[PDB]
């Protein structure tokens, strides 16, 4: 994992920009705004709290390494994703229509760019009388 | 395609069996009716004047019972395997590991044993047969998921514990006192009120309003005291039922209101969208750190998806408009400062 | 003028008959009282010690019944024809097509048949006479429009289904368990507790608080167990009544609150005004397209007239003042921008 | 000074008698207890085994009753005259014109008549004596001002009329149907279920949960049907009590909430202040017109004092903050216009 | 350190004994179960067919009772002394001064006396023994702190006094009237309805739904009147229980809502901080006056800590946003004035 | 009543200022503002509605004459005044303290000038342990 | 129906102003504002949704033709009109007073011009003790 | 107590700044603002009401002397302090953690300066697995 830890350290040095070795709300906000995000101070606080496990309020290199070590594809994550998909389900039959999903992704929550939405719609089988299973989606996007 | 539909219907069967909703409830109402009919026939088997016909019809109904529950059992195993968590032999075994699946299994083999013993006529089996019949209630017992009913009852009982205890304490005091007084008044004229325990039995039967009539005060003074204390005690004995019923109804109203105020739709969509972002995640180091940040967003939106699960409060909007107040304050401050800058 | 008043009163008769309100309810209360008196006399006809006078008075009361219901039937037909939808022969036939109109028709001819058979004394008619008498309840049955009562009950039962099922399940468990235990304790000392079915009858009578007294535990242990389980079970058997009553009362409170929050007045006036606009509708093409747009306005105001029918919600005003917030934000933004323009 | 205190205490006596509050309620509780004791002794006079002592003590208690009520009657007349509306002979006569004052008068003279007849022993009086005794309930009847209790009950019954009628209709249907079925099942095996009227009596006693036990089903099928229909019917018969109780409790909660939201204090003070202005009223024409305007202010503040009596509504504050919205709109409009003027 | 832990655990014992919470409630549930078992055995001692075994087991259970309550008594004294208010001999004496501590003391010495008398067999003690046994309920009586239950009941009864009185008045009228009518109808045919007092007993038993069955109307007219008045009266007799239960449930809902709206956290912290300021208090005169001002702050924050204890009201936020309105008004006024200054 | 009707007509002509013979909201508002009142438009509407009995929305001379004909001292007015006094009563004993009445008149409702308040307090007997009957007040101010 | 379809096409071309063949919110808003209406964007969205039946959000010529084909006088429309009139009814006797109807039309909902209101009041029989039937109104204005 | 009354009079003369002999809201506010406090008018009213016992609304010298005579260490004060500490208690075991107390004192209510907070934390025994008794605190700060 020498390459992996080297990459993690490279990223952490990119974010830190100094020898402090910890991530503060202001520095993280400035780095993320360098890409043109403009988040909130509460956003910074919540994001940093999500990472820290000691309660000091700063993300040290070990905390970032531990956070990035765990794989995204996890059983609890899969269950959360499945129930989130079920939240917007009709009859709970495991299938969703393309149009309603398009509307949900375009209005509810984080409004995504139409290019990405069309890419994901065309990624899977959208045929079948306009109904597409989301179990298949869940399988593909949890494959890492 | 064909296999696709095969698993699609298999999933629908799983839904109707292990996920009752709509007509699946009608299906389970039917099986409950069959269980209840079996229980009623089992009870009638006790009566000797009807034991012959009761048992005769009960044999055929038990045969139908075993057939239908075996079919439901195997269909349930298959449909559960449908869900990709209980798929394959290992997954079917895991589903069987469920406490209610093993309970169904044991009750089913027990039922077969009942039928076989009936066919045989073993005295030892015969004696055990009634206890075996009792097991069929286990179907209804299983129909309650995670003891929902129980928990609900407990919840209300805990919510109103202070007042339930008040009602119980006052009613118990009234029972003891009134029973003692009626005992004293009628210890001699009435033989049924001979021992204070008999007076306590009378008091319990009276205050609950059961009023069997086996013991009733006769002396006029006894009847006057009985009337007064009966009024008080019937009220206090009826209290707990009223308190629990009102608690249940108010709980339903709260659930309804919370359902109406459910704002979790948009944060849940945010959770889904950040999940898709984290998927898209999976300059090498820049991509890896972007994946890390996307996972952080996923967790943050899950927390948001959870804090939405917390129902609505008026205190929430009080703070919301309170934020409106601070907003207006700052706004006017800035305005006046810049207008003063203009004046300058 | 004369005909005008003729139809005006005809319409008032329709209102009092098919549209009860105010004193029309007093009128229908009277006819219900007559139906109830007929039913009571019909019941008393069963008693042999009073059969002679019961039937004697019942003949005259049935005569009065047929007269009054025939008069109400014809007046109802005429007044219904008043409404311009059931006018003319075809409209009267359509009104007769109503299920309750045909029900009234059949019960009326049946009543005449009762009277004629009474006059005759046919044994075959005589035997059928009691079944014919039963039909008079059909008047009350008709008095319920579209099964309102039923629906209402169902609604509440569906709203509180989870808790009703909880109460039923726990009460049934208590009934079975307590009945079995009292059976075991008293299977020998008490003869009335001989068969478990008898114990179940005792348990049902006890826990409902009917307490006939035909079966009562005698052994002291039996009485102790009976007392404890009777307390628990009487509470749980009384639950469903309490839950339903609290549901009914909370539903009334909700209806009252919704009535107070009824804001539909102004949108309903908008609907009326756009209806008048669409009327005024009915450059040729410009007029035709203006008519089209006026019809669109009519439909839009109908939708507004419907979304007002949706009762009030606090979430609504939460969004309303939330709109207030965005408003203030934009406002202050604009202000500061233009003041900066000034400073420049 | 002396006369001043004389009328001051006279007014306090009026308060305790005709305006119960605090300990005056304790005073009236005492007189109610005396009335109730007289009624209980009058009832015991019926029993022949106690008639001698019952009547002996009842004579002295009736003597005390007449003395105390005569004293209360005269004190009430005097204290009522205190109020400057019933002052003087004419005012005392007007107070006697009150229906409850004349009722007190008649019951008092009746009581004297009871005592005199007792002293005499007239058979004709003796026969009338019990009816005369009954009159004492008139004291409690009077204690209810303007039939408050009645009205309150009526109000709730009218508020929940739809659901009370639902419960009555369903319960009546269950009663009729279950009684008929049990009659059919037990018309032969059971003699007490001989005539359908007897079955109706059994059904009424069962479903109300009175359960006398005089009639009870014996045949097992009869007992099964009785059990099922008894469950349904006991629930529906218990409904009306539950609905009315929940209505009463919700009404109390509403009254409490309205009391808390009572904003009438400041408008009532406005009414008092404009009343003082109108007093100060009473350039001649200018003074007269100023008096006219002050009377108009008095009436306007009375209307304000009345619209405050209308309890609070959330819809009210919805309109209130809605006015806030229009305010902010106009405000920002003006601001931007004048800032544009600046820019110019 | 060692002594530190010694007093720490001593304090925990005080918490579990005199400050029930969590498992200390489990502990007190156990002692209540022991008291209840002692009471049940004491009752069974009354029965002569079980007196021998009842008393035999009751001797050992009373021995265990005295042992456990003596241990709890001494542990309670010690743990109470822990709290630094009952520390030392004087503090232990003060704790014994508590009414419930002295009650525990007397019941404990009484119990020893019971055991000693049992050992002896004194007839005079023997006769007193049952009265001595009764004292054990004093444990439960003590378990209620400051009569909480009682007060709560009283509160609700006072809150719903008007409607409880309505129900009582109407029910009493129905009882009297129906009893009199059934007496009149059945004074001759039925012997049990011989004296109006017997009719009153029947009416009380019927309307409460006790329905002993000792007296039941026989004549058909009597049964009809009994049925109708029984319906009305059972409803009105069931009212008070329903009203009280709904009051209890609504009170719980209010308590829950107030708990959710509890904003006292920040003002309580202000109270703590100003208390620390006043501590820091304790230029000489400047320091003394600063101490005075800090004490004033302490009292002011205590008042704030108390006005927070006052639960939440919507009227509060109505005034709050109303303050928002005046704020916006002043704000816009200032804005326009200064913009006009600019224009100038 | 020739003098009385003459005075009423003089007042009505003072208010009307023209030959219209009716009182409108705007004209009444201007006349009352001439004394420095500055009321509201809703105030004008309510005031005019209180006078009119035909619903036209304007006070004609007959309506003003009818309004001013009825005497202020009336039984219903007396009852309203008595209950209004009772609203702020303690124990309903017919007596009120000078201090609480002063506070009520100075804060609640139409805040009066201290001169008038002191005049009315000194008008009646304010002695007696600080408690003054309001029944006596009610009698005096209803005497016309 | 050649004349009718020609008129419908003329109107649709007047509204479209281009060869697109569909009606968008912005274009419809501009055309209607040309007469001085100044509606809202939500108004445009609701108006266009009321016409469209395919969910695309634009009114094509066939949709406009179908909308204008159905006659205004319909049984369901008549029932809706009758119940709307009943909403503001007193005792449900089928009659309404001229004054209350005038007030309703002048305040509630779309405030109409007094000229039109007077025209409609004089259109029908307004005599009869100030009460006019609205059933007769309903009959006349549904005659097309 | 001649020295004590002399000190009290010196303080009262410092606050009064004149021969009036009473403390008004405005004068007290100005004196306290001289140190840079900037309180509210409602603050002044509440503070003066807390001192006055006659209801006149001004703190005379006797009232200030009576207020300063009573000792801070009182049984009722001790009970109030103990219950206030219990308000933020966990399990009611008499012990509180240093971190949660730090957070409470830094956020809830009057936000104190970190210097004072650290001084008070170091004043008592903060060891013992991070848990410190507040009964000991209560004893020390009530010692006067
Ligand atoms: C009667 C026989 C014995 C009864 C004992 C059974 C009674 C019993 O032991 O209750 C335990 C538990 C209590 O905890 P429970 O989760 O229900 O209570 C929540 C919790 O109290 C929160 O504090 C409340 O918020 P708040 O801060 O106050 O505002 C919240 O109310 P709300 O805000 O969401 O509305 C409550 O939901 O509830 C059960 O699971 C019942 C299981 C029953 C299993 C055993 C059944 C016997
Ligand atoms: C039935 C037998 C006889 C019953 C008599 C017993 C009944 C009895 O005598 O009540 C006395 C007392 C009433 O005063 P209580 O403090 O309860 O009532 C408060 C007070 O009324 C306030 O005025 C209310 O606010 P609001 O201004 O209205 O808005 C407030 O309601 P809320 O705003 O906070 O919600 C009330 O809390 O309550 C008891 O202590 C019961 C002790 C029972 C001891 C005796 C028990 C028998």
- Work out the number of other CB atoms within 10 angstroms of the CB of residue F113: 9
Q: How many pairs of residues across C and E have Cβ atoms under 8 Å apart?
A: 22
Question: Are the C-beta atoms of residues B202 and B208 closer than 8 Å to each other?
Answer: no
Q: How far apart are CA C30 and CA C36, in angstroms?
A: 10
Beta-strand runs (E) in chain A = 22-23, 59-60, 95-97, 131-133
What the block records as the tokens of D336 is 């931007």
Q: How far apart are CA F141 and CA F122, in angstroms?
A: 14
From D227, which residue of chain C is nearest by alpha-carbon distance? Answer: C204
**CA separation, residue C54 to residues C42, C47, C114, D198 (Å):** 7, 9, 15, 16
Q: From the CB coordinates, do chains E and D have 3 or more pairs under 8 Å?
A: yes
Q: How many pairs of residues across C and G have Cβ atoms under 8 Å apart?
A: 106
CA angle (H11, H16, H17) in 5-degree steps: 100
Q: How far apart are CA C72 and CA C14, in angstroms?
A: 10
Per DSSP, the residues of E2-56 read HHHHHHHHHHHHHHHHHS--THHHHHHHHHHHHHHHHHHHHHHHHSTTTHHHHHH
- DSSP code of residue D189: T
Whose CA is closest to B331, among C338, E319, E328, E318? E328
Q: Confirm whether residue A58 is marked as ligand binding.
A: yes
Q: How far apart are CA B220 and CA B185, in angstroms?
A: 9
Phi and psi torsions of E299, nearest 5°: -65, -40
End-to-end CA distance of chain B: 78
Q: How far apart are CA C92 and CA C79, in angstroms?
A: 10
Mutate to test the pocket of ligand 1, among B154, B163, B165, B248 (most ligand atoms within 8 A of CB): B154
Cα dihedral across residues B158, B162, B167, B173: positive or negative: positive
Q: How many Å separate Cα E265 from the centre of its chain?
A: 26
Residues 75-104 of A with CB under 8 A from B: 77, 80-81, 84-85, 87-88, 92-94, 104
What the block records as the tokens of B302 is 């899950």
Q: What is the CA radius of gyration of chain C?
A: 33
From E324, which residue of chain D is nearest by alpha-carbon distance? Answer: D324
Taking the CA of residue F140 and the nearest CA in chain D, the distance in Å comes to 9
What residues pair up with A23 in beta bridges, in sequence order? A59
Which bin fits E141, alpha (ψ -120 to 50), beta or left (φ > 0)?
alpha
Whose CA is closest to B7, among A95, A80, A75? A95
Phi and psi torsions of C274, nearest 5°: -70, -30
Per DSSP, the residues of C9-70 read HHHHHHHHHHS--THHHHHHHHHHHHHHHHHHHHHHHHSTTTHHHHHHHHHHHHHHHHHHHH
Whose CA is closest to E242, among B206, C153, D232, C242? C242
* Chains in contact with chain G (at least 3 beta-carbon pairs closer than 8 A): C
Tokens 């005006």 identify what position?
C8
What residues pair up with F59 in beta bridges, in sequence order? F23
End-to-end CA distance of chain C: 78
CA angle (D278, D279, D281) in 5-degree steps: 65
Whose CA is closest to A120, among A135, A98, A91? A98
Question: Are the C-beta atoms of residues C173 and B150 closer than 8 Å to each other?
Answer: no
- DSSP code of residue F129: T
H or E segment to which residue G22 belongs: strand G22-23
List CB contacts of D58: < 8 A, sequence separation 6 or more: D38, D41, D42, D45
- Work out the number of other CB atoms within 10 angstroms of the CB of residue C128: 15
* Chains in contact with chain H (at least 3 beta-carbon pairs closer than 8 A): E
What the block records as the tokens of C324 is 């207030």
- CB proximity A115 to B under 8 Å: no
What the block records as the tokens of A41 is 């101070």
E249 closest CB neighbour out of B160, B328, B342:
B160
Across the interface, do C241 and D230 touch by the CB < 8 Å criterion?
no
3-state secondary structure of E102: helix
Q: For the purposes of burial, counting CB atoms within 10 Å of the CB of C81, is it exposed (0-12), middle (13-18) or buried (19 or more)? A: buried
Question: Are the C-beta atoms of residues H109 and E272 closer than 8 Å to each other?
Answer: yes
Q: Confirm whether residue H114 is marked as ligand binding.
A: no
Q: How far apart are CA C222 and CA C182, in angstroms?
A: 6
Nearest CA to ligand 1 atom 12: B155
- CB proximity A68 to B under 8 Å: yes
Across the interface, do H68 and E291 touch by the CB < 8 Å criterion?
yes
Q: How far apart are CA B235 and CA E241, in angstroms?
A: 5
Q: How far apart are CA C39 and CA C58, in angstroms?
A: 9
- Work out the number of other CB atoms within 10 angstroms of the CB of residue G16: 20
Tokens 């005269």 identify what position?
D74
Pocket of ligand 1 (CB under 6 A): B 150-151, 153-155, 157-158; E 256, 259-260
Q: How many Å separate Cα H53 from the centre of its chain?
A: 19
Q: Kindly state the greatest CA–CA separation across chain B.
A: 111
Q: Confirm whether residue D146 is marked as ligand binding.
A: yes
- Work out the number of other CB atoms within 10 angstroms of the CB of residue E117: 18
Across the interface, do A72 and B282 touch by the CB < 8 Å criterion?
yes
Across the interface, do D195 and C245 touch by the CB < 8 Å criterion?
no
Q: How far apart are CA D169 and CA C153, in angstroms?
A: 11
Phi and psi torsions of B189, nearest 5°: -65, -35
Whose CA is closest to E163, among E51, E223, E244? E244
**CA separation, residue B85 to residues B11, E52, E67 (Å):** 12, 64, 58
Q: How many Å separate Cα E171 from the centre of its chain?
A: 28
Least distant ligand from the CA of D255: 2
What residues pair up with H22 in beta bridges, in sequence order? H60
Q: How far apart are CA F29 and CA F40, in angstroms?
A: 8
Nearest CA to ligand 2 atom 2: E154
Resolution value (Å, 1 decimal): 3.2
Q: How far apart are CA E128 and CA H63, in angstroms?
A: 63
Atom of ligand 1 nearest to the CA of B311: 34
Q: How many Å separate Cα B308 from the centre of its chain?
A: 24
Give the Å distance between the CA of E232 and the centre of ligand 2: 30
CA angle (E137, E143, E147) in 5-degree steps: 100
What residues pair up with F86 in beta bridges, in sequence order? none
Q: What is the dihedral of CA C140, C144, C146, C149, to 10 degrees?
A: -120
Q: How far apart are CA E293 and CA E286, in angstroms?
A: 10
What the block records as the tokens of A14 is 């990119």
Q: How far apart are CA E141 and CA A78, in angstroms?
A: 56
What the block records as the tokens of F127 is 């002695």
Give the Å distance between the CA of E27 and the centre of ligand 1: 19
Q: How far apart are CA H63 and CA H76, in angstroms?
A: 21
Across the interface, do G84 and C268 touch by the CB < 8 Å criterion?
yes
3-state secondary structure of H23: strand
**CATH number corresponding to A6-69:** 1.10.238.10
Q: How far apart are CA H100 and CA D117, in angstroms?
A: 85
3-state secondary structure of C195: coil
Q: For the purposes of burial, counting CB atoms within 10 Å of the CB of D302, is it exposed (0-12), middle (13-18) or buried (19 or more)? A: buried
Q: How far apart are CA B234 and CA B208, in angstroms?
A: 6
Least distant ligand from the CA of E165: 2
**CA separation, residue H65 to residues C135, D3, H10, H15 (Å):** 93, 47, 11, 13
| Helix axes of H75-87 and E265-281: crossing angle, nearest 10 degrees | 140
Task: Name the method of structure determination.
Answer: cryo-EM
- Work out the number of other CB atoms within 10 angstroms of the CB of residue A62: 12
Q: How far apart are CA C156 and CA B48, in angstroms?
A: 42
CA angle (E22, E27, E32) in 5-degree steps: 120
Question: Are the C-beta atoms of residues B18 and B79 closer than 8 Å to each other?
Answer: yes
Tokens 């349904």 identify what position?
D232
Taking the CA of residue E211 and the nearest CA in chain C, the distance in Å comes to 8
- Work out the number of other CB atoms within 10 angstroms of the CB of residue D124: 8
What the block records as the tokens of E329 is 């008004």
What the block records as the tokens of E73 is 């008594």
Query: Residue C147, CB half-sphere, CA atoms under 13 Å: how many?
Result: 6
**CA separation, residue D246 to residues D58, E238, E242, E248 (Å):** 41, 12, 7, 11
- DSSP code of residue F58: -
Whose CA is closest to B137, among B62, B54, B32? B32
Q: How far apart are CA D261 and CA D271, in angstroms?
A: 19
Three-state SS string over A31-59 comes to HHHCCCCCCCHHHHHHHHHHHCCCCCCCE
H or E segment to which residue C309 belongs: helix C284-309
Per DSSP, the residues of E136-199 read THHHHHHHSGGGHHHHHHHHHHHHTHHHHHHHHHHHHHHHHHHHHHHHHHHTTT-STT-SHHHH
Pocket of ligand 2 (CB under 6 A): D 256, 259-260; E 150-151, 153-155, 157-158
Q: How far apart are CA E39 and CA E44, in angstroms?
A: 9
Nearest CA to ligand 1 atom 17: B155
What the block records as the tokens of D298 is 């008095």
Q: How far apart are CA C166 and CA C157, in angstroms?
A: 13
Q: From the CB coordinates, do chains A and D have 3 or more pairs under 8 Å?
A: no
What the block records as the tokens of F105 is 């008149």
- DSSP code of residue C145: G
Binding site residues of C, as ranges?
146, 162, 259
Which bin fits F89, alpha (ψ -120 to 50), beta or left (φ > 0)?
beta
List alpha helices for chain B, DSSP H: 2-18, 23-46, 51-82, 88-96, 99-120, 123-134, 137-143, 148-159, 161-186, 196-207, 220-260, 265-281, 284-309, 314-343
Question: Are the C-beta atoms of residues B211 and D211 closer than 8 Å to each other?
Answer: yes
From B342, which residue of chain D is nearest by alpha-carbon distance? Answer: D342
What the block records as the tokens of E244 is 């009280």
3-state secondary structure of D109: helix
Q: From the CB coordinates, do chains D and C have 3 or more pairs under 8 Å?
A: yes
Across the interface, do D223 and C237 touch by the CB < 8 Å criterion?
no
What the block records as the tokens of A127 is 């045929």
């Amino acid at each position: 994992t020498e390459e992996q830890i080297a990459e993690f350290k490279e990223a952490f040095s990119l974010f830190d920009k100094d020898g402090d070795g910890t991530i503060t709300t202001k520095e993280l906000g400035t780095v993320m705004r360098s890409l043109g995000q403009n988040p909130t101070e509460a956003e910074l606080q919540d994001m940093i709290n999500e990472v820290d496990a000691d309660g000091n309020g700063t993300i040290d290199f070990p905390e970032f390494l531990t956070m990035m070590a765990r794989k995204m594809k996890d059983t609890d994550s899969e269950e959360e994703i499945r129930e989130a998909f079920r939240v917007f389900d009709k009859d709970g039959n495991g299938y969703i229509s393309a149009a309603e999903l398009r509307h949900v992704m375009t209005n509810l929550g984080e409004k995504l760019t139409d290019e990405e939405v069309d890419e994901m719609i065309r990624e899977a089988d959208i045929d079948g009388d306009g109904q597409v299973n989301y179990e298949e989606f869940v399988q593909m996007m949890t494959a890492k | 395609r064909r296999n696709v539909k095969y698993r699609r219907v298999q999933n629908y069967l799983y839904n109707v069996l292990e996920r009752p909703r709509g007509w699946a409830f009608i299906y389970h109402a039917f099986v409950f009716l069959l269980v209840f009919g079996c229980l009623i026939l089992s009870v009638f088997s006790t009566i000797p004047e009807h034991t012959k016909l009761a048992s005769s019809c009960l044999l055929i109904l038990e045969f139908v019972m075993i057939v239908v529950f075996g079919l439901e059992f195997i269909i349930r195993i298959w449909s559960a395997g449908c869900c990709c968590r209980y798929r394959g032999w290992q997954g079917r075994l895991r589903f069987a590991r469920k406490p209610f699946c093993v309970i169904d299994t044991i009750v089913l083999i027990a039922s077969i044993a009942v039928v076989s013993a009936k066919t045989q006529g073993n005295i030892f089996a015969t004696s055990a047969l009634r206890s075996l019949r009792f097991l069929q209630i286990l179907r209804m017992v299983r129909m309650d998921r995670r003891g929902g009913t129980w928990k609900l009852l407990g919840s209300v009982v805990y919510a109103h514990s202070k007042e339930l205890i008040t009602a119980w304490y006052i009613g118990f005091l009234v029972l003891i006192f009134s029973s003692f007084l009626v005992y004293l008044v009628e210890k001699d004229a009435n033989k049924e009120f001979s021992t204070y325990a008999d007076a306590l039995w009378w008091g319990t039967i009276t205050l609950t309003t059961i009023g069997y009539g086996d013991k009733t005060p006769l002396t006029w003074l006894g009847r006057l005291l009985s009337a007064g204390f009966a009024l008080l005690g019937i009220s206090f004995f009826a209290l707990p039922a009223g308190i629990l019923g009102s608690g249940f109804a108010l709980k339903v109203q709260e659930q309804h209101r919370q359902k109406h105020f459910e704002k979790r739709r948009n944060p849940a969509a945010n959770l889904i969208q950040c999940v898709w972002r984290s998927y898209a995640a999976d300059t090498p180091p820049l991509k890896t750190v972007i994946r890390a940040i996307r996972i952080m967003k996923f967790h943050v939106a899950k927390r948001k998806f959870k804090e939405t699960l917390r129902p609505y409060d008026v205190k929430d909007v009080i703070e919301q408009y309170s934020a409106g107040h601070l907003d207006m304050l700052c706004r006017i401050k800035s305005l006046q400062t810049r207008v003063d800058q203009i004046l300058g």
